[PDB]
Amino acid sequence: FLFHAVQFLIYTIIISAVGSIINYVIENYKLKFITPGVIDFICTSLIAVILTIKLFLLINQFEKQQIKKGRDITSARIMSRIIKITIIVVLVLLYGEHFGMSLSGLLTFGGIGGLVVGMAGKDILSNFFSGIMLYFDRPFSIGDWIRSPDRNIEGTVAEIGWRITKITTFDNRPLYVPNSLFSSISVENPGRMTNRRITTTIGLRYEDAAKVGVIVEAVREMLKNHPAIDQRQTLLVYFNQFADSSLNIMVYCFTKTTVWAEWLAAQQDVYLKIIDIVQSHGADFAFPSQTLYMD
Amino acid sequence: FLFHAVQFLIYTIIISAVGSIINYVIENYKLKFITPGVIDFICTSLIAVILTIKLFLLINQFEKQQIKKGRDITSARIMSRIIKITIIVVLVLLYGEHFGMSLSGLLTFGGIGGLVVGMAGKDILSNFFSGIMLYFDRPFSIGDWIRSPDRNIEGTVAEIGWRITKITTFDNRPLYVPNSLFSSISVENPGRMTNRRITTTIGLRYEDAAKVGVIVEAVREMLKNHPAIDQRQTLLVYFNQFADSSLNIMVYCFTKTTVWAEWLAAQQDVYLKIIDIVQSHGADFAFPSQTLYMD
Amino acid sequence: FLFHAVQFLIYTIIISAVGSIINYVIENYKLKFITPGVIDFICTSLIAVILTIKLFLLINQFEKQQIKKGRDITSARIMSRIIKITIIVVLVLLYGEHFGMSLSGLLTFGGIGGLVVGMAGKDILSNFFSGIMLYFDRPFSIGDWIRSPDRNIEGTVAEIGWRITKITTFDNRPLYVPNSLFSSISVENPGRMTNRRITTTIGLRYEDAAKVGVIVEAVREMLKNHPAIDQRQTLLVYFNQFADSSLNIMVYCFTKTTVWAEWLAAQQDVYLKIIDIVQSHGADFAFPSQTLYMD
Amino acid sequence: FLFHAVQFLIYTIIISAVGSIINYVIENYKLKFITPGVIDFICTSLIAVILTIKLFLLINQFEKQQIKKGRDITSARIMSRIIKITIIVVLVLLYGEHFGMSLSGLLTFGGIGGLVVGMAGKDILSNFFSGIMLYFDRPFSIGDWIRSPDRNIEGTVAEIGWRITKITTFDNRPLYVPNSLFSSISVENPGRMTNRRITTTIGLRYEDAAKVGVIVEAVREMLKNHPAIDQRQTLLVYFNQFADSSLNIMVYCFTKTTVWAEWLAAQQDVYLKIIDIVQSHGADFAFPSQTLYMD
Amino acid sequence: FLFHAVQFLIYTIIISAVGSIINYVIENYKLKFITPGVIDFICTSLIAVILTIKLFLLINQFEKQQIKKGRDITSARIMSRIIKITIIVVLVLLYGEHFGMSLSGLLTFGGIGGLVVGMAGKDILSNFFSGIMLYFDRPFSIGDWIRSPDRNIEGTVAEIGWRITKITTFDNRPLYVPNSLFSSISVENPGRMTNRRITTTIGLRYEDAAKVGVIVEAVREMLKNHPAIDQRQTLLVYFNQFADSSLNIMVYCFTKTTVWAEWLAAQQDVYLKIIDIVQSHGADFAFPSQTLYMD
Amino acid sequence: FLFHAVQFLIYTIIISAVGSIINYVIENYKLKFITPGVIDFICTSLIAVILTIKLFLLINQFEKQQIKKGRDITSARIMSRIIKITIIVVLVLLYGEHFGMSLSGLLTFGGIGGLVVGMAGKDILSNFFSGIMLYFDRPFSIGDWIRSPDRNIEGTVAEIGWRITKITTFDNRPLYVPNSLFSSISVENPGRMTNRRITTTIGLRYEDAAKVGVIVEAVREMLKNHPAIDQRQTLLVYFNQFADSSLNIMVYCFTKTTVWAEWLAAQQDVYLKIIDIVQSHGADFAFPSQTLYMD
């Protein structure tokens, strides 16, 4: 805090004054060896006390219930024990040359301990870094409907957090996705689509081949006069498949709107018109067929 | 413990006094070389003895049966041997320059040994860190029904531990899930859902197409008058699929309640009404169909 | 052993006496340079000899046949050669500066050799650490029937070892599972279940819809009067599926007992009662159905 | 900026002058110890202040809204706190030998922290490096239709960014692909194709074998006279499969054009001609067949 | 060898004598600087020559054909070149500061070269370590039939080597399994089974339900009187499944023997008795069934 | 370039002359401390300027448009900024002992920065190294048709680059394969085949068994007289399978040619001859069969 910053500045000024006083004492009349070690140790202890006071104030800050009241008594005690152990270990590690006769040994111990700690914390660190990356550059926005072809994250984005992203699925169920997933998979955004697509297949019986041609023309004509079909996009109607029991004609077009209900209504209208056209020309749809040889 | 802390403080004061006495002896009349090494070794031995006493008290604390009585005699002996070997190795490593004439060699040995130990313990460390993370930020709570699309962890959360999470499945069988899984997979929380979804498909016979339209209207009308259907959510009834042997009409709506029994009752009532409506208009459902050509 | 510990203590006392004698000789009248190198080398050789004697005694301990008699002659010779080579390499690396005038090269070689050895031994180290963890915290116990949805480890736990767990499968075949698997997969414990679950589906013919409703009621009534059904658990009987050739009614309940035979008997009794109820109301079960159009 | 560069050059000149003045003071009449440390500390503080001013100017540059206005107030505060902590930690670590009595300990701490940070940031770093590689050497270009057999990235390339690539799918939906994927998967570019391929199978009835031969010839003749078929490419028409209920004849050719509509039209024309040829010779297509033995 | 060991001991004694002579020369009248470098270099060269002689003797030992005659001439030449290069590189790196004026550079080069070499040799090292593990603790023995649910290693163990295990499959084909696989997969040992299991399902037609009950009883009675059935193991006969076209009755029992032939004979006898019992009560087995609706 | 090399040689000569002059000044009458630092700094600055001039000439070489004109203005600016930043960072790190008062701190900073950079660049480095390996030893050649059983890389090799390999697929579509894939997957080369294989199965009706034998003989005779069948390769015709509705006879032979068209023609001729032989002996092919039991 600001008071903590002022205390740290005062401690730094006091440390500088102590160093200057030690230098002056050495220059004029040195006592003990140089007696700089005692002053340095006192300054380090004062800095550690100031840091501990600032940490306690942060713990006793407006958060308060975050560790004290929100968590269970035993759980809070365990968490406090862990954080105290960690902070005292850090304080021992960073400045211990006065009390370290080994110097290199505890240095190596701290180094390899931090190494294993980092290798273990890799996943949480990756989630945090991916959260920062999403903060800076993100492919979506709140309220956008997104999905991925690699995983199952379909839904509408509801909230973006520091660790996980909350998405409202299509059955009104919250889903929490780790942020790191957004750095290794392809993300698709149907919420920013420009048109909806109508694709279908018409299966005609094998003895209607002589009609197939004209039928296709008729269908195309309808797709060129429907007011709900975008004429500037792809529009293909062709016979392109010998199916097992039928001849298949593809239908591939786009609608002018992107909203769900009118898209479905246009699809239904197109399907009904297709049925009427097919039945009007004397052809008919094909059920699965078989040839049976009886004894 | 508090007594252990007091003993450690007394040992630190004694070490400081020994260092001051060594400095005074050097200043006045030095003996041997400086004779600081004997005092430092004695202080280190005293600190090690105090630490061993504290560790024994912790072992002989109220836990007692945790290592002594709970485990088997041979298993307890093996565990005690392992922990003794580890603690003596640590004590040798951290402070051994007095007895180390190699310095570099044993420090390198300790470093690479800690390296392999950390690489091996990676999984347990990850589980512990994920447990801490779940303690701080977790997507669920005790009593919530959760599931994931990546793994099989379906059930209701019963307990959250330091290493694993205990979940009661839907067949009354406990399931233990490692904590690390919660840092790499998507977690869905149906227990926080707002509505239940009713989705179904009506398959009508092919020669019923001329009626399909009006039937859809009727169905929609019913879904607009049912008192158990949420009118503020999605409500879609459209014909949108040419199936192999039928025309498919989708039904997609939501219920006002989230409880299991009333949701199932509403679904059954809706299905019965749909059957009545379909049969009332002269149409009928379609079985799988085939066309047979006999010789 | 205790004799080995006494020998080590005597060697440490002798080393301390040798160091004190070297210091006294230096103080009074130094010979050669300090002649501390010869004394230190002799002390190191004595310590190495004591360690080798202790290792030989451990090899020649009550185990004896573990390496000597149990293994084959050539295999035992190879194992002894390997362990001797490793022991001498360790003795070289831990204390060699009296012979090392290269120091840096040999320490680098030892470090990177231990590094590759650690990466190679990773798997065995992980198994041992997981065994220790299972010793401290384990989700199961001897005699418990366990299974996992990720791997195939179904069976009853028979023994827990330092490296692997032995499980008796349901066809009376032992199965050995590495311990590390228990630190990365979800473990389910059906042996601690509280109730057994009865779930089934009744498929009625399509023209039986007018009866379906009342039939459901009847079934529910039976499930409310069966003395072998737990009335405090979930009990659902509803029509909730339009199948391909039938209407599906779900049945979902729990039994009071957990033993296999009575659970199966109760399931059979419930199934027979369901059949009787269904046939009594004039309905019938539905075979797979089809509609055939002949030429 | 240019002003920042001029300030840095002035600071470097001032540091050189301070070093020269310290050397001259030492040569003529040294004060304190050498009093070079104060000048070096002042120069370092000035350099740090200049760097902080340049960073603030960059933050307050034309971007402005990038961190200040574009992001949320709490999010912007968190980001500013994070970047401030990081930059002050960097300034502490790069030059701290004046204030570091331990030197080695903080060196090890910074090294291990940077190590874990790098292992965490691996993914973002890989994406950035793959973006650079795509900038230099890339297999596609803007507007090209691409696809991969390993993942689902089918679509037309729309934009290439520093981190992700934006591709317009065939249903007018944007898709964002991480750049790293382009360094480990095979990328196919149909947008640079030279011809379109027509492949199909003709299934004739089993008692039509006596005709099969001549039919093949006829088909080949047609494929040698169609003006839309590339005669310089592969052209194969052969009977090469005993199917379950038919004899299969392969058709394999290429079209002269690459555009979608004319390719589909040519395929339809070829299929109609094939049907006419097959029916003209007295043969017929084969439905799935079966032999039934009645009781 | 023993002669090599004697030569090494003589070389060590000579090196100690050379060091003592150098110390005496320095004490009495030093020549050149100390002239210890020439003596140390000569001792190192002698040690290297002795090691090379021992290595050549090992190469020219009773193995002989292992490298010389067994391998091809070009292959043997390549192998000898590789081993000589490695030997000379080791001799350079282990002790080279007399000729190394860089010291740090060559040690860094050796360290990172060993690092890459170890990372590459990881797999072979893992196989060797798993071989040692199997030597000490192994779940099977020679002649045991083993299998795994994770991989395909089914067969009878024939030989255990330092690197791989040779297993005779059930079609008399040798199979070589790397040892490392035995440290990460579950190993099942059917060769140590105690009983063989008989499991089957009886499918009765739907209109035999009124008989099902008594039929089950009859079957159970037979299973309680068969002399080849273990009465102390599990024995379950119940109706527990509504199949698509039948009612399913489970049969689950164990045989007293474990050998293949009598187990198969008992299974056949039980099946024949089951058929006789089923046909005696008027019921019959059910073929797949269907309901056909003709136009 | 050659001019750059001459400039570098001149700079090296100037640096040697400066060192000699500094040594001579120290020997005769030293100024300042030794005043060798200024000369070394000037030489380093001159070397850096020469290197920068050479780099600018390489940028302004015949490539020119590679960075300047080919890329977009903003993209080129970003790339130039990145490369300049990297160059200045390298120049700072390689020689900074004059300006480094910390020496070790920025040393570890650069070390761990290079560590993360290498871990990120791993993939591109692997692709480059695999390209070099393919340059030296490669299993294919330009124009060869290759495929793999692990991935989908089927096609004919068209170009081999430093990073990716361009392969023309069988539908005239280019495909770019990363080079690293060629170091971990099996590569098959059908372009170097020696013969084409004809394999098929003849399914005869069940009541044709009395003929099967002689039929096989007939078929074999034909395969021994066909001029397009390689008689020196495998030639097997045997009845070896009880199919569901037929008896299966295998046919397995090789053709003398490897070209596509003649291989297909020979296969068609063999199939027609097989049909004629089968129908000549009174047997017939078998459709899928079934037995129906009517009520």
- Alpha carbon B118 to its chain centroid, in Å, reads 22
CB-based contact, E27 to chain C, within 8 Å? yes
For residue E199, how many C-alpha atoms fall within 13 Å in the half-sphere facing its CB? 6
Nearest CA-CA distance, residue D72 and chain A, Å: 10
**8 A C-beta contact, residue C268 and residue C206:** no
Rounded Cα distance, A215 and C147, in Å: 60
Which chains share 3+ C-beta pairs under 8 angstroms with B? Answer: A, C
Q: Which residues of C touch B268 (CB under 8 A)?
A: 216, 238-240
Q: Which residues of D touch A89 (CB under 8 A)?
A: none
CB contact set of F184 (below 8 Å; sequence gap of 6+): none
**8 A C-beta contact, residue A202 and residue A283:** no
CB-based contact, B67 to chain C, within 8 Å? no
Q: Please give the full DSSP string across C263-276, using - where no structure is assigned.
A: HHHHHHHHHHHHHH
Q: Please give the full DSSP string across D240-267, using - where no structure is assigned.
A: EEE-SSSEEEEEEEEES--SHHHHHHHH
- Tell which residue, E195, E188, E209, E172, has the closest CA to residue E284: E209
Helix (H) or strand (E) holding A19: helix A2-29
Q: A173 vs A146, B137, B195, B200, D58, CA distance in Å?
A: 15, 19, 8, 19, 43
Secondary structure of residue A233 in the 3-state scheme: coil
Please return the burial class of D294, using the count of CB atoms within 10 Å of its CB with bins 0-12, 13-18 and 19+.
exposed
| Nearest residue in chain D measured CA to CA from A24 | D32
| Contact (CB<8Å) C172/E197 | yes
CB-based contact, A127 to chain B, within 8 Å? yes
Secondary structure of residue E268 in the 3-state scheme: helix
CB-based contact, D295 to chain F, within 8 Å? yes
CB contact set of E117 (below 8 Å; sequence gap of 6+): C116
Q: Which residues of D touch A203 (CB under 8 A)?
A: none
Rounded Cα distance, B108 and F274, in Å: 77
Using the CB atoms, write b or e for E46-66: b if 16+ within 10 Å.
bbbeebeebeeeeeeeeeeee
| Contact (CB<8Å) D106/A119 | no
| Paired strand residues for B178 | B164
| Contact (CB<8Å) D126/F112 | no
What does R_g of chain A's alpha carbons equal in angstroms? 37
Q: Which long-range contacts (CB under 8 A, 24 or more apart) does B82-89 make?
A: B82/C132, B87/B52, B87/B55
| Paired strand residues for C147 | C188
Other Cβ atoms less than 10 A from the Cβ of B9: the count is 10
Nearest CA-CA distance, residue D247 and chain F, Å: 10
Rounded Cα distance, D95 and D45, in Å: 10
Rounded Cα distance, A261 and D229, in Å: 44
Rounded Cα distance, C81 and F20, in Å: 59
Tokens of A76: 């809070």
Helix (H) or strand (E) holding B175: strand B174-178
Q: E269 vs E223, E226, E259, CA distance in Å?
A: 11, 10, 16
Using the CB atoms, write b or e for C152-178: b if 16+ within 10 Å.
ebbbebeebeebbbbbbbeebbbbbbb
Angle in degrees, CA D292, F284, E287, rounded to 5 = 25
- Tell which residue, F62, D169, D183, A123, has the closest CA to residue B132: A123
Tokens of C10: 């005597």
Q: B224 vs A269, B214, B270, B273, F99, CA distance in Å?
A: 22, 15, 12, 13, 80
Q: Please give the full DSSP string across E97-155, using - where no structure is assigned.
A: TTT-SSTHHHHHHHHHHHHHHHHHHHHHHHHHHHHHHHHHS-S--TT-EEB-SSS---E
| Nearest residue in chain A measured CA to CA from B254 | A171
Nearest CA-CA distance, residue C189 and chain B, Å: 6
Beta strands in chain D (DSSP E): 145-146, 155-160, 164-168, 174-178, 187-188, 196-204, 236-242, 247-255, 289-294
| Paired strand residues for D202 | D249
Beta strands in chain F (DSSP E): 145-146, 155-160, 164-168, 174-178, 196-204, 236-242, 247-255, 289-292
CB contact set of E69 (below 8 Å; sequence gap of 6+): none
Elucidation method: cryo-EM
Rounded Cα distance, A230 and A256, in Å: 5
Rounded Cα distance, A86 and A128, in Å: 21
Residue type, D169: T
**8 A C-beta contact, residue F280 and residue F219:** no
Interface test with C, best of E15, E199, E236, E240 (most C CBs within 10 A): E240
DSSP class of residue A112? H
CB contact set of B101 (below 8 Å; sequence gap of 6+): C40, C95, C97, C98
CB-based contact, B28 to chain A, within 8 Å? no
CA atoms B149, B150, B154, B160: torsion sign: negative
Q: Do chains D and C touch (3 or more CB pairs under 8 A)?
A: no
Which chains share 3+ C-beta pairs under 8 angstroms with C? Answer: B, E
CB-based contact, C183 to chain E, within 8 Å? no
Q: Please give the full DSSP string across F141-176, using - where no structure is assigned.
A: -TT-EEB-SSS---EEEEEE-SSEEEEE-TTS-EEE
**8 A C-beta contact, residue E50 and residue E8:** yes
**8 A C-beta contact, residue B292 and residue C292:** yes
Rounded Cα distance, A17 and C292, in Å: 103
Other Cβ atoms less than 10 A from the Cβ of E87: the count is 14
CB-based contact, C217 to chain B, within 8 Å? no
Tokens of E295: 């136009």
- Tell which residue, D209, D207, D212, D220, has the closest CA to residue D274: D220
Rounded Cα distance, F169 and F176, in Å: 10
| Paired strand residues for B157 | B167
Residue type, A74: T
